[PDB]
Each structure stands twice: as C-alpha cells, then as structure tokens.
Amino acid sequence: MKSEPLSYLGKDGGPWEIFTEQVDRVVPYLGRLAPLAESLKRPKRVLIVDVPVRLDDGSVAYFEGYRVHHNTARGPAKGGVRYHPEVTLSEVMALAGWMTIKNAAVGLPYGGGKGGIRVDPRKLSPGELERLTRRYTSEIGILLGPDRDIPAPDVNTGEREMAWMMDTYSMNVGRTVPGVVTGKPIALGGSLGRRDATGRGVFITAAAAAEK
Amino acid sequence: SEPLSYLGKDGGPWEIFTEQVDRVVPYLGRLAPLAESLKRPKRVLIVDVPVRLDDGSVAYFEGYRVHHNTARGPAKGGVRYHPEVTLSEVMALAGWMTIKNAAVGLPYGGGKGGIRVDPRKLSPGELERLTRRYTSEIGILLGPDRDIPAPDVNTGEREMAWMMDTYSMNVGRTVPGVVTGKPIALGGSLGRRDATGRGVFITAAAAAEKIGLQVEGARVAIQGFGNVGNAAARAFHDHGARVVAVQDHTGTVYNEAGIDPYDLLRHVQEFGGVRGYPKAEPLPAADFWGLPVEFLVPAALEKQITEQNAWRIRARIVAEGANGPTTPAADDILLEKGVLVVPDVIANAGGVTVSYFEWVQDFNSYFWTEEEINARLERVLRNAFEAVWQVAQEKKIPLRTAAYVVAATRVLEARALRGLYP
Amino acid sequence: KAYRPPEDPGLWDTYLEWLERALKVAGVHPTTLEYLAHPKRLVTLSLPVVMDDGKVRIFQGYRVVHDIARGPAKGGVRLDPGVTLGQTAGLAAWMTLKAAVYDLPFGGAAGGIAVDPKGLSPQELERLVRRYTAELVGLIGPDSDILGPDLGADQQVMAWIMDTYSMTVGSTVPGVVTGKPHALGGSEGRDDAAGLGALLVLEALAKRRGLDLRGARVVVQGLGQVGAAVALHAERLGMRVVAVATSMGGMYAPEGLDVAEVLSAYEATGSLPRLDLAPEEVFGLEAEVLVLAAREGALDGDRARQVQAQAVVEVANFGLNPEAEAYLLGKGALVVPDLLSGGGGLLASYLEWVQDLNMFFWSPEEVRERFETRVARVVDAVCRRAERGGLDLRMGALALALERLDEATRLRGVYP
Amino acid sequence: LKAYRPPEDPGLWDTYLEWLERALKVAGVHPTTLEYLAHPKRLVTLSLPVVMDDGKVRIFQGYRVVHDIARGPAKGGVRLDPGVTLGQTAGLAAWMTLKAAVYDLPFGGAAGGIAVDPKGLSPQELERLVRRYTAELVGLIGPDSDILGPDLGADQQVMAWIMDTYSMTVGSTVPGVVTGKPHALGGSEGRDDAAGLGALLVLEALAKRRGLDLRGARVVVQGLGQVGAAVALHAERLGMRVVAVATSMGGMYAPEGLDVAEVLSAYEATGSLPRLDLAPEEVFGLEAEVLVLAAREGALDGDRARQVQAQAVVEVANFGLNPEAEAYLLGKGALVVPDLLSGGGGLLASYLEWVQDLNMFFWSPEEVRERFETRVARVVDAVCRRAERGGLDLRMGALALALERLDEATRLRGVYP
Amino acid sequence: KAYRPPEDPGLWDTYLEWLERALKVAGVHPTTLEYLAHPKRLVTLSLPVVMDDGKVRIFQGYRVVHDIARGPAKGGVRLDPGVTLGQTAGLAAWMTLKAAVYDLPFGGAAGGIAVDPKGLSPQELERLVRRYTAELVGLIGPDSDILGPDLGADQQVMAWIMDTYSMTVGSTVPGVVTGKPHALGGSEGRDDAAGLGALLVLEALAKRRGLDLRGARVVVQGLGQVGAAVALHAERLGMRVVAVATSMGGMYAPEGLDVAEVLSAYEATGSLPRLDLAPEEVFGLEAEVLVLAAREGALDGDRARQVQAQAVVEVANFGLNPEAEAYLLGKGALVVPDLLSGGGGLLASYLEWVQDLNMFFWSPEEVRERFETRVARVVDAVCRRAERGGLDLRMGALALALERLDEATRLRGVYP
Ligand SMILES: CC(C)C[C@H](N)C(=O)O
Ligand SMILES: CC(C)C[C@H](N)C(=O)O
Ligand SMILES: CC(C)C[C@H](N)C(=O)O
Ligand SMILES: CC(C)C[C@H](N)C(=O)O
Secondary structure, three states: OOOOHHHHHOOOOOOOHHHHHHOOOHHEEEEEEEEHHHHHHHEEEEEEEEEEEEEEOOOOEEEEEEEEEEEEEOOEEEEEEEEEOOOOEEEEEEEEHHHHHHHHHOOOOOOOOEEEEOOHHHHHOHHHHHHHHHHHHOOOOOOEEEOOOEEEOOOOOOOOHHHHHHHHHHHHHHHOHHHOOOOOOOHOOOOOOOOHHHHHHHHHHHHHHOOO | OOHHHOOOOOOOOHHHHHHHHHHHHHHOHHHHHHHHHHHHHOOOEEEEEEOOOOOOOOEEEEEEEEEEOOOOOOOOOOOEEOOOOOOHHHHHHHHHHHHHHHHOOOOOOOOEEEEEHHHHHHOOOHHHHHHHHHHEEEEOOOOOEEEEOOOOOOOOHHHHHHOOOOHHHHOOOHHHOOOOOOOHOOOOOOOOOOHHHHHHHHHHHHHHHOOOOOOOOOOEEOOOHHHHHHHHHHHHHHHEEEEEEOOOOOOEEEEOOOOOOHHHHHHHHOOOOOOOOOEEEEEOOOOOOOOEEEEEEEOOOOOOEEEHHHHOOOEEEEEEEOOOEOOOHHHHHHHHOOOEEHHHHHHHHHHHHHHHHHHHHOOOOOOOOOOOOHHHHHHHHHHHHHHHHHHHHHHHHHHHHHHHHHHHHHHHHHHHHOOOOO | OOOOOOOOOHHHHHHHHHHHHOOOOOOOOOHHHHHOOOOEEEEEEEEEEOOOOOEEEEEEEEEEEEEEEOOOOOEEEOOOOOOOOOHHHHHHHHHHEEEEEEEOEEEEEEEEEOOOHHHHHHHHHHHHHHHHHHHHHOOOOOOOEEEEEEEOOOOOHHHHHHHHHHHHHHHOOOOHHHOHHHHHHHOOOOHHHHEEEEEEHHHHHHHHHHOOOOOEEEEEEOOHHHHHHHHHHHOOOEEHHHHHHHHHOOEEOOOOOHHHHHHHHHHHHHHOOOOEEEEOOHHHOOOOOEEEOOOOOOEEEHHHHOOOEEEEEOOOOOOOOOHHHHHHHOOOOOOOOOHHHHHHHHHHHHHHHHHHHOOOOOOOHHHHHHHHHHHHHHHHHHHHHHHHHHHHHHOOOOHHHHHHHHHHHHHHHHOO | OOOOOOOOOHHHHHHHHHHHHHHOOOOOHHHHHHHHHHHOEEEEEOOOOOOOOOEEEEEEEEEEEEOOOOOOEEEEEEEOOOOOOOOHHHHHHHOOOOOOOHHOOOOOEEEEEEOOOOOHHHHHHHHHHHHHHHHHHHOOOOOOEEEEEEEEOOOOHHHHHHHHOOOOOOOOOHHHHHHOOOHHHOOOOOOOOHHHHHHHHHHHHHHHHHOOOOOOOEEEEEOOOHHHHHHHHHHHHOOOEEEEEOOOEEEEEEEOOOOHHHHHHHHHOOOOOOOOOEEHHHHHOOOOOEEEEEEOOOOHHHHHHOOOOOOOOEOOOOOOHHHHHHHHHHHOEEEEEHHHHHHOHHHHHHHHHHHHHHHHHOOOOOHHHHHHHHHHHHHHHHHHHHHHHHHOOHHHHHHHHHHHHHHHHHHHHHHOO | OOOOOOOOOOHHHHHHHHHHHHHOOOOOHHHHHHHHHHHOOEEOOOOOOOOOOEEEEEEEEEEEEEEOOOOOOOEEEEEEHHHHHHHHHHHHHHHHHHHHOOOOEEEEEEOOOOOOOHHHHHHHHHHHHHHHHHHHHHOOOOOOOOEEEOEEEEEEHHHHHHHHHHHHHHOOOOEEEEOOOHHHHHOOOOOOOHHHHHOOOHHHHHHHOOOOOOOEEEEEEEEOHHHHHHHHHHOOOOOEEEEEEEOEEEEEEOOOOOHHHHHHHHHHHHOOOOOOOOOOOHHOOOOOEEEEOOOOOOHHHHHOOOOOOOOOOOOOOOOOHHHHHHHHHOOOEEEEOOOOOOOOOHHHHHHHHHHHHHOOOOHHHHHHHHHHHHHHHHHHHHHHHHHOOOOHHHHHHHHHHHHHHHOOOEEHHOOO
C-alpha cells in the first residue's frame, strides 16, 4: 500500500520536499533497511499551538507556535526554537528532519525536533518577549522533558530565552530541571566550551581527514 | 495576530467557521474584544499513524486531533475516518463543537479528530490497529477531564470500544468516560438511538408554545426518514400531531388523514425508502415544500431549503433535524414570511446531550433508566431553547443568530472570568 | 484451558467445572473462554510485621485479579489460616461471575492473608493489614482493583485499608475499599445486606413457584454477619426460625426462636445458649427452608439425602456441593444458587462505591429502594434466561453471566 | 491540656482551645483524638513575589493551614485582608474541622489567607497575587486534598482565578479544587446568598421548635456584606422588621422597619448607608428581639453584651460573639445561636457545589434549594437532639456532636504513618 | 524590606545584617534582594508518634526553603530541643549563601524537630523521623528539597529518611538525603569532610600569606565528628594540637596532644583522659590557630578579647558573631569565616548526591581528589573577589555569593 505525501502542506514544494529528497538519495545505500526509509518521511508528531500574550498596551496578541518531533527512534527529540516572522510549519518540519539526521550522524542519543514562533522579536519589548517564551513553554509542556524533548537556541533565540524556558518548565513541574533545555547560561546549568565548540570541531574533523 | 499561515490562502471550511464568528461580534457587548480568541484553535496535534497491514507491510496515515477552545471544559468531539480529511476541516469542525457545546449548555469546550483513510480499503483487523495506534498517539491529550472523543463519519460503537480499551490498558485503569458512543456493555448510555429525533420534537414543541400553536392535531412534514426523521415522526405522532408528508431520496408520499410512522418505517426498512408506500399517494418532489402544515422537519441533506423553494413554505415552524438544511437567502425569506426556524445547533443537539449524559454516568458507572434520560434530555433542550428565545427577543434577531450569540457569549464569559494565564 | 493452581485447586476446579457445563448452553467465543480460564494476575506477598515482642514475623498474602472485561476488579480480603492462592483464584473467578449476574460494572478479584486473626494482638493485626495494603498501592485504586470485606475482615479492617491507602497516596480516597464504617464513607448500613439480599431473592422466587413463606420454618446454617442477618430478617418477615447453627452444633426450637436474644448471647459469649443438635443433624430438620450461610463445602452429596427442606438457599460461596445440588433438583426442591442469593454484599458494595465516588450519600430509604429494585431486576433476568434455555437457576445465571462477559470481551478485543 | 502554640496573634486559636476543653468534659473523646485536635497537621507560610504595576517586585505573605482531615479532604476559605496572620488562620482551620463535623460533611478543616489590602492593589496586581498563591499551593491542594473556598476579601472572581491557575498548572479542567465559583465555571446556584439564607433557616427552625413566632419580630443586622445583606433581605421576606443595619462605619436605625431594598441599593452603589444614625458600637444596645452578628470576629465583647436588649442573638460570622458575652447572654436568659450552627450556610452551599463538580452534573435552582433546606433542618434537629440528651445549650450540643463524629473517625482510621 | 520570624530571629537577623553589608560592595538587583529577604516557604508540622507506653505524643517540626535560584533546595535536619522556626529560617538562608560561595547548584533549606533525641528510645525516635519524612514526601525529592545531617541527626537518621521516602514512593531514591551510611549510597568522602575542609581551607590561605603551619599550635573548640576530624587532620599535616575542648572544659599539652589517643579515650569513656582547662580558658591559650568547631554563638565580643591566636577558623555556623570578628580583624588576626571553612560537609554532600544520581561510586581516592580540587577553587574565587574590592574574606565570599545569586535570579525572572 502507498503512503501518500503529507496532505497538510499543499501541492508544493518547499523545505520539506528538499528534506525528503535527501532521504530518497540515500535509499539505494540502505540494504535490508530500505523498506523502513518511508518512516523518515513522516514526522512522529506535529503540535501547532496558539500563543496568546498580553502586550504592554494591555491588549492581547496571538502568535503561531510550533513544536515538531520528526523522529524519536534513537532518543528524545532535540532541536532549537526559531523566532522569525517568516517561519512556516513546513520549514520547522524540514529543520526537525535535519536534526534527526545531524544527531544520528555524530551518534548522539537523540531523535530530532524543532520549534518556531512566527514573530518579529525586534518588534517586541523584552517584557513581552518573556511572556511569549513562557506561554509557548507552557503550551508545549505536554511534550517537554529531559527524556522526551529538549529545546535549544536557534535563529533569534539564545541564553535569555533558554533561561526563561528552563524556569517556566521547572516552576510548572515543581522541581528544578536544568536538562529540559540546552544552550543555557552557565549560572543555570550551562556548559563550558560552547563558544569555541564548532570552530574547534571544524579543526578536529579536518585533522582527522589529514590523518587519513 | 495575522491570519493562520499554515492554512495558506486556502481557507475553505475554517473561513466559513471564522465568518460566522465575525457575524456574531455585533452582539457580544463588552465581550467583543475577546472574540479573536474564537478564531484561534488552542491546539492542533497532527500525528503519524503507522499500521502493520495484514500482508506484513507498514502503511502510514495522517491523524489529527484539534482542541479548538477549552474555556468551558475539556474538549469534546468525534473522530472521523475519511480519505478527504484535511487539517482545515478538522479545525472548522472543532470550532463548531465549541459553539454547539456552549449553545446547549454542556460543560465542554470543542474538539475533533480525523484520520485521513478510506476505511473500506482496510480489513476489520487493520481498522482496529489503526484505531488503537491513533488513540495511543493522541494519548497525551486524552482523558475524562481533558479530551473526550466520540463517533463521527465512518466510526461508531466498534471504534469507541477500541479507544476505551486502549486508553484503559495504556493507563492501567478502567476509564469508560474517556470517550462516548460506546456500547452499553462497556458503559454507554441508554436512549441514544432516538435522542436527536426526540430533541427535534422537544425543540419544535417549545417553539410551538411561544406562538400558541397546538401540537395535538397539527400537521407535520418531514424530509428524510433515517434515524432522525423517523424518531422525530414518532415523537410527533405520540403527542397527537399528524404526519402528512415524508420526502426521501426515493420520492414523496402524502396523506392528509395522517401516515402512521411505525407503519411507514416497516415499509422503509423493507423497500429502502418511501416510494410506493401503500397507504399514501405519490407527490411531486417540488410540491412537498408548499404543503399546508404547521411543522416542517428537514432531516436529510444540507441546502434543501433554498431561494428556489423558500417562498412556497406554509409551515409555521421549521425545526432543523439535519446540519445546515437551509441557506442564508432562505433564512432571509422565511424571516419575512414570519416562519420560526429552530436552528440545527440546538434543534438536533439531542445526540450530543446524551453523549454528555453517558459521560456523567461514566464518572461512577451508575446508569440511568431510559425515562430518566428522556426527562433530563427535555430539561436540557427546553432550557437551551428558552435562552436562545430570550436573546432573540432582547436583540431583535432570528433564532439561528441568537443561538450563536448565546454560544459565543457563554464561551467568552468563561474566558473573561478565568483570565489570561499563563 | 486452563490455568492450573499449584496447590489447593478445589475452588478453581469447581469454577472450571461450572464453566464447562455452561459453554454447552451459552454463546461464548473461544477468546472469552481463554480469558475466563486464566486469571489476569496472581500476587503472592511477603508481609513483614514487627510483633509486640519486638521480633519480626513474616506473613504471606495474596491478591488475584481474574478478569476485568466488564470493569475494574472488585473483590474481598480474607484473614484466615486456610487462605491459599488456589482458594483466592477460585473466589476471584467466582466474583467475576457473580458481578456479571448482577449486571455490575466490575471484574472479579480476591485476596487473603494466611493468619489466624484471633491469635494476634489488635496492634499486630493493624500492622499486618497496613503492610498488606501498602505493598498493594500500585496495583489497586478506585478504578483499578477495589477491595472489600470477607472472612475475618470486617469494617475495622476496611478502615485501616482505607486509611493506609489514603495516607500513602497522599489524598483521601474512599473508593479503594468497600464495607467501610459509616463514618468513613460506608453504609447504609450493612454489612446486613448479604442476608437481606438472600431473603429478597428467596422471596421473589417463592412468589414465582407458588410456595408458603407465610409462617414457614427456616433453618440457618452459620451465624456470622451473613447468617445472623438472614435469621434476623427471616423472623421479622414472618418466617419461623426453628434452628441456627455454627461450627459447634445447632440450637433448635420447633415453634420458632427468639433470634435477637440468641445473637445477643452469641455475641456475648461466642457460643449458643443451648446445643440441641450435632453440627450435621441441622440439615435433616423438618423445615420448609434450608439456608447455607457459613462456609464453602457445607453440604455434600451424602448429607443432601437427609434434607426435607423444599427450598435450599445457598448464600455462602460454594456452600452447596455440585453433587448435593443435582440430587435436590432431582427431588424437586427449589435450589437457589450463591451466584444469585449471595450477591447482597456485592450489590451493597457497588452502591457504596457509587456514592463514595460522587461523595454524596443517599438516605437509608433511598439505598433500600435502589437495592431492592436491583435484586428484583436480576432475579427477573436469571429466570428469563433460565426459561428460554429450559434451565435450572444456576445454569440460567451462568449463561446470562457468560453472555455479558462474552460481549464485553469481544467488544474490547486483545490489547496489548 | 497540651496544644500547639501559635507564635503570633493566638487569639482565635485560644478560643478554639477553650471550647475544646469545655466540650471535652461532656463528650467522649479519646486522648489520641484530643492530640490530633490540638495540633494542626500542617501550617504553611509562603513568600509571594509579585511584579507591581510600576515593574518593581513586592513580596507578600500568605498562609495555608490544614488542621485535621480525619473526616475527609480539607475544606477552607481564603482571606485577603490586612489582619491575616498565621495565628488566626490556625484558629479558623480548626473551626472549620468542627463546623464541617456539626454539618456532617465529609470534610476536614483548613483555612488560608494573604496579608493584603485588596482594595489597595490594581486588578492586575490582585490577580497576580492570587495566581501566585495558588501556584505555590498546587502540590498541596486539589479536589480531594484541600478544597479552597471564599472568605473576607475573596470574591467569586478570586475563586475563578484560583480554579484557572490550578487547572492550567495541572493540565486538566478541575472545577472542584475551589468553591464559591461563578455559576459559569462549575459554580452552584445563587448561593452564596447561602450564608444568610442559612442563618435565617436555622433561626426559623429553632423558633418553630420552642414555639415562638417571628411575624413582626424586630431584627438588628450587624454587618452588610454578602452575609448581612442576605440576612437583612431574608428576614424582610419572612415578615420581620429589620430595624437597623450597621457597617464598620455606623448604623442606620428605623424603629418601624427599614426598607431593605432602599438601604442595600444605596450601599451597593456608594459604600455608605442613606443616613448614619448611630456610631457602629451603639447598634448592639438597640431595642430589638433579634441581634444578628454578620460582620467580623470579636464584634460583641463581654461589656457591650451588658447593653443587649434582644432576646435572640444569632452569631453568623465566625467568633462574632465572644465567650465572655455568650456566658452573660445565657445568664440573662437570651437564646444564643452559635456560628457552628447558624454560620454554616456558606459551607453547606460550598459542599453542594463540590458534589456537583465531582461528576459535572448541575441541579436546578429549585433542586439546590430543596437539598440545601433539608440538610439545614437535619443539622438543626441533630444539634438540638444532642443538646437535650445531655442538658446543654446549642453551642455545647453542637460541639458534643462534632467531637463524637471526629472521635469515631479518628479512632477507626488510627495513627499512620 | 524583610521577612520577620515570629519566634526566634537571632540567626535570621544575623543573616540580614551580613546581607545588608554585602549589598554595598556587590552589584545586586532589587528583585534579587526581595527573594533573598523572604524565604520561599516555611512549613510547620505536627508529628504524631505512638510512644513505647502506647500513648500518642505529638512533636513539632519544620522545613523551610529559603531560595532556589541556583538549583534544588539543600539543607540539614536538626533533632534538638532548641529548634525553632526562626533558627531553621536563619540556617536555610545561610545555606543559600554557603552553597553559592561553593559554586554549588543548590538553593538553601533547613529542617528540624523540637526533641531531645537522647530522651527517646530508638523505636520512638525512628517513628518520629519516619513521620517527619512521610509528612514531607510531596515537598521533598532528589530535585526539589534534598535533606542531610545536622545537630542531633546522624547517619542512622539519614537511613530512616531515605527508607521511609523510598517505601512511600515505590522506588529506590538515594538522592532524597545526604550524609547516608556507606551501605545505603553514602559517600566515602566522608562525614569527616567538615574537618578536612576546614584544614584544606586553612592551609591554602597560609600558603598565600606566608604563615608557617608545620609546628603551629592549634586549639580545637568542640569534639564531635567535626572537631575530632579537625584535630586528626591538623595533626596529620604536622601541626601541634595543644588543646581540645568540650562543654565540660579542655585538655592541654604544650607539647601537643596525642590526638588519636585522646579521641580513643573520648569515644571509649565519653570523657577526655584529663581536664586541665575550665570551659572559659579554652580561647585564651597561647596558640597560632583557634578552631571554632562546635555550636553557634561560641565566641562573642567579650571572649574575643581573650583570643591570642593569629588565625581563627569558624567552622560551626555562626561560631563567632559579627562583633568578635570586627575586633579580631582590628587586631590583625586572620578570621576564616564559616561560609568558607567548613563548607566541607556541604561539598561532600554534593559529591554524595552526584554519585547517587547516577549510581556509580568513586574510590576513597577519587572522592578525595575531586574534593580537594574544589576547595582549592573555592578559596581562589573568594580571594580573587576579596582582592578586587579590597575586602576582608567574609565580605569577598559574601559578594561572590550575592553576585552568583543575582545572576541566577535575574536570568530566571519572576514566574508564575
Ligand atoms: C481556559 C482559558 C479560557 C484561559 C487560560 N487561563 C488561558 O490563558 O488560555
Ligand atoms: C478483556 C479486556 C481486559 C481486553 C484487554 N484489551 C486485554 O487484552 O486484556
Ligand atoms: C487522618 C488522621 C486522623 C489519621 C492518619 N492515619 C494520621 O495519622 O494522620
Ligand atoms: C529565582 C527563581 C527561582 C524565580 C522563580 N521563577 C520565581 O518567580 O519564584
């Protein structure tokens, strides 16, 4: 039986298609594992949530948020959160797909996940930005957990947003859970070595090649 | 605060829901600023549902569970299995459950689910594994105090049994009230087969009183003779009204001396329809609408009452058994002729009232007799009609509009009292 | 076909045997059969208890959950030196049937501790009971496995279960156990319902076969909570109670007994006023009604020959041997089975639990009604299923119960 | 008698202790029961931070006391008032244990409060405070552990924020964690006008019992909140002459009867009576048949009691009437109706709200009324029955009744852990 | 500005005094100051115990969580007649600071019960401890509130906390409490960590400021687990322990005591082999190092005038009060504050928790090494900070703690 491409994206043709094509180009090399490939072209879970926020002027704005779990076989979902006015569902699906790939490529015990809020953070006050992160964090609460889904920074998010997510979750759950997100400030269970990791990594892998 | 980007410009049925919210704002008073919340589903969960097929291959199906609004209680609404199930569709339908649940006064928000599948292509075993996997997948949403699914298009007692069992085994507790529409054996309610028809009568009769119309000896025309239609028929008959005309997809029968619904039913069961019923005369399809009757019950397809037929309707009262049997143009026409239209949202809400009774009984697995069911059924629909009637008079608006006003007001009042948190 | 209990197979074998007979007369699908012939789970617990002298003693306990197709497990707790795993299974399976007969939303369960409760200080017994329920908290609860009273376990035992569960779980949860004191969400009242229920059933059945209950003579075997209640209500309903009996013998008076006065002397001393009869002479007495209200295996094939009752009412589970029943039915007696006349306490528990969950309690007279109309409804259903099948009462009840169990099981299906 | 000692403001607790010890002499109470009764299970003080309108954090202090839960989950109102202390909360929680018991409800006793001037915060500050109080309590409250309820400075709107905060934290619609909700949210019907309706139902039963009539009896209502207003209102419809009402500012007096419609209307619109006739303390000494204490605690002390002319004194507010003033009024022959009896309407109404929220099935206004009335009557008759059994006044018969129900529940359940 | 304890504010008010002084020398946000000045939650429990004679006695206990900005709450338990809410509050706040000075991911907490532990039988005490932990199950845990040892609460007490909690929750949860026995998930290092820490700190500070330690004379005030360890390690590192003291008085040997011999005698007989000194004289000996390793308030302003030591090492919390510290600093003494010396118990407890959480236990060697590395780091950070602001050791530590608390607090913000 055929598994039809996802109905909810439209007959186009964007970032999700580029990801599935990458899945396709890999299938000749999979051996006995090939029939399973289809599952890679299927997110486990897509949660679209409404994130309401009382603005400074006391009115209520409503933002679109997303948390997608692409795949969960190797472990819990891991992936950052993007805050960008041009973020779409299908973009987040794609990115969640790439995280499944990237996590497996280095053999981290993680599935792949991503989230996004359709918002221009430049246009929000720091106070509104915080209420945004807190409400989103409550809304995806049913997904979250150090053994379930672990968000992280991405485009337009960093330490500040990760600090609010960690706090929101811990208060919501009645215990201190540093490992519910990554990219936190050192003061909150951050790690040393975050700033140089990727550059150093570029070197480590280049040297490993030189070796060969 | 701009329109939902994951629908693209391709609105469709969600925009229909959204427009109806717009149409109600003029009536909201100090609640109108909150109206935007109704244009946003609290949440949408799209799940992959993988099923091991009888031949040993794996098939993958998109499933949806939508919580449209949650101000008045847990999400409530059925699950549909249809190959044309779209995200937009489920959302629109979750919206309509919020409205309906509030208009009738149930302590429920609105929900709906769908799997995009053609159940006919699947064996009983595959449909089972489909059902169980969907209910595991939406397991983070389910619970007697969180979300309670139900039957809808291509689902019924059989699937609900499966959902309850799966949820119960998954959670290690027996929890009959996680879904409704179950069989009696597993904690369903008595009184389900006739609830909707019965309720059409209950609502028409309440309307009748407001205008001094005697039910006894009143003439009734009914379109559709399925579960709703024939339940309405018997309910009308057993209160002394005469059924003079039934219309089917097979034809129209007419008899001014009355047609006995229980006898028509034997004929419809035997022959598939009303055509050739021996104790009535055949009637041209168009003349059905113009019959001189007191009560008209459209209980079949949608848009049966249109521009093209509205002007001929002589009935004092139209009680909608089916969803959307009458167009906005016909609304405006019937409004001018002075005929009361009891709108579907309350008029056919008997089904969902009994579902709610099932859920109440499930809390302690203590079950009501059928007479208790019908007694409380009456209470709910009479109260719902009285409140719809009250707002129609206060605001000088038709019953259909009044019903949405009540619904949206009740939802928004609950949101306003609870406040915005977190 | 079929779980084998490692020891003490008796009660399970009897259950099995009745099931085999009822399959020939009832629509039951293989899957249902398979489930009914294998208890879902069997838990043996070791129960450490620091005794009064400060030394540790371990007791052994059981909880068996049979079949759960109709709802959460419901079942009693025995405190008795005779308690075994085999006995517990049999009883758990019997509950499943008895609940299905009463059309109750319960599956069947049973549990016990192997102890003589009279040989412990009340302090020691409290500890034993509390350890039992603590070891069980992750396997029981109001929508899971609801415990209840049985041999050597009364209202005070049920209180300790309740208190122990609630303190651990950390919220107050009256629904985990039935047969509680009124103060803690029990009632109303009874405790006294098993006997009441027994008479209600006998009533409706006598009324249906044309039989003098008007001043007819009754013999009651057993004077625990159930028998005391039967005797008590039998007198007030205008029956003449000629005999009562215990594991010591029987007190007899041919014109009737002053029952309240007897239970007073019995409750005072632990013995009957006078002993006119040997423990087995009781069965062969001249009376219209023999009621079995003590323990399983009370009446064997041989002793049934001596019986001249026209009505034999089995209240204690398995009080009446398969073989004694066959003979009395052949002689033409009305034989009322445990599954029917022994559901009073189960019904009362159901009613009790409903109210607990709701946390709203009916008046004494609202309970009575609801109880009474339910007994009548199930007597009616057993007879309708009997009639249609051309069956005695047991087989009727068995086929009715099986049909409901079949329906729940096939609708739910196999999962996981 | 060995008992818990509150470190601050022990007045209300001490009173409870006095009554416990008197009642001990006339009711069968085992020593263990007495120990549980004399030491609250748990007293919780919270620091409640709040972002004020200016953006500065201010921290408030709140309390939650569970006294005793032998008879079921704890029930307890929440006070938002500048005089809220741990001491008085302790006293109120224990009073709840007894009250619940007298009314035969399956509840233990609790109480809560925050030391705040609610009228002094903005609507948003008040809301944030109530939410924080609730979030801090989430793991310790719930529909079968500790069920919150209204009290001084705590509205149906406040109850809503409590229900909502809990529900959002726990991720389920849970109406039964609090009572006194708006009808829309799982609230029950009209009552709470229940405190006042109840007060009068108790008076009426106690009168038809001792063969008095209230047709044209003169009533002084001290207090005009939810409670007093309804007393005044209900007194008027039973054909009593309400001769004075009194707020914390003073009282308005008409020897021939006040138009209760007129006075309530003005007070609701402006916060004042149409005219001030008496300073607040002069209202007790008025020539009337009935005196209703429907304000705060310690309203009528020992000496001001020497001024009372009224034959019947109805204590509705908890500890409205001081023990020294109850003795004197009893000496002089007056009928004294205790709070444990006549202050029990709100609690009973709340119980009925709770019961309905358990299965989310709502009775009609008339069903609610009927069930409310029969339980009041059963409670009045039970208290009177226990009183005449042992030759006691109402308070004491009530206390006896409570202690023996508490003792039964405590003895059966035992010590554990 | 601040929470006011209703009972016993001494320790709390001392905390406020240091806090107010430290504010002037560290960058601290207003909102941080708010949190630091009002403890999150103070809870008082009534604790029923069934006494040996069968009568129920109710004890009073406490658990206060002061501030959780930096992680889960961590705090000891006192079984002592002097326990009050105010004391527990003060100790909880001191814990927030201590933990912050040590760069530990802990908030501050403290608990206790008003009881003389010697005055109960072991059965009565075990019951009292179990009721305490039972009543706290919903408010404590390996990531909520982690308990540990303190005055009158030894490793056996910790065992009972752990067990009770683990039996309640149905899971084995070592990380609910620290100071446990080795058999139960305790750490090798050590429950003599308080003492070693005190000395590792001391030796580190003398190395820095040219103070010669081999052959320096040490006086130790106090001889429980803390003092004993101080004395043993001071001798190991080549110092002369000229005096050790208890509340009865002191033993003195100008040549330096045989520490192990003196402690053998103390353990064996419950007394020092001889008593040269009155309790007063202890502080007035001629020595290089005086160690406060007993109880709060040991050295006040008057007694400070007695001290002839170049270095005074506060190990007990609040061993010396602000007034004695000012005086001794004015005289040129090195005062090592409790926030630094004897954070050793707390650091070990932390290393215990880390090991419990992933159930893998380091060698006595490996614990020692991670323990040393961390005290050397803490001494470095505190000194670097003191020096940048030209402050004394206490102030530097204070400013460090406050800066770290302010970071965690401002980053997390106010929520709910
Ligand atoms: C249930 C909802 C109407 C209210 C909720 N506090 C929210 O912000 O979404
Ligand atoms: C009989 C029922 C409990 C069925 C259940 N799904 C099982 O397989 O055990
Ligand atoms: C509720 C209480 C009266 C009983 C409980 N076992 C306790 O020790 O606290
Ligand atoms: C410092 C943090 C623990 C702050 C926390 N989110 C609160 O508002 O209480």
